[PDB]
């Protein structure tokens, strides 16, 4: 149970913005600590994280026909990898 905190990378000009610097932001699992997003991405991309930042993404409400919706909630965490390091895995 570890490739479970990491969900998928966030893909957005703004996400990319910080690849250049040391900053990889991705969708984590909503109940994850920063203490865990850490030991997670650490044992997952074989880097050292010096800094995790998080924020919830209250899910917007879409709709269709009369049927009135509500998209699921989320939690970007954004990791600042030890100096110099990188994650080719993401740098496409």
């Amino acid at each position: 149970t570890a490739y479970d905190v990491i969900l998928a990378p966030v893909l957005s000009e703004k996400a990319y913005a910080g690849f250049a610097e040391g900053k990889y932001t991705f969708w984590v699992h909503p109940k994850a600590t920063k203490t865990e997003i850490k030991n997670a991405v650490e044992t997952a991309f074989k880097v050292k994280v010096v800094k995790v930042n998080t924020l919830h993404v209250r899910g917007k409400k879409k709709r269709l026909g009369r049927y009135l919706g509500k998209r699921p909630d989320r939690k970007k965490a954004i990791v600042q990898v030890a100096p110099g390091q990188k994650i080719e895995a993401l740098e496409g």
């Binding site: 570890a2 490739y3 479970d4 893909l11």
Partner: protein
């Protein structure tokens, strides 16, 4: 058919076994993640690879 084969071989995970029920699972999951990363970027996934994996793991998790 995918069942019979794997599951039999899966108690066959009994050299080391629960330890391996486990080890295997861990590896299985990294695959799922690698797989849904490929999934999200689009230009690297073809579907059921996903389902099939998740369920390996439900079985593995047994």
């Amino acid at each position: 058919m995918k069942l019979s084969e794997v599951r039999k071989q899966l108690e066959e995970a009994r050299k080391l076994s629960p330890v391996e029920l486990e080890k295997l699972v861990r590896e299985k999951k990294r695959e799922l993640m690698e797989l849904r990363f490929q999934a999200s970027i689009g230009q690297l996934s073809q579907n059921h690879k996903i389902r099939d994996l998740k369920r390996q793991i439900a079985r593995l998790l047994t």
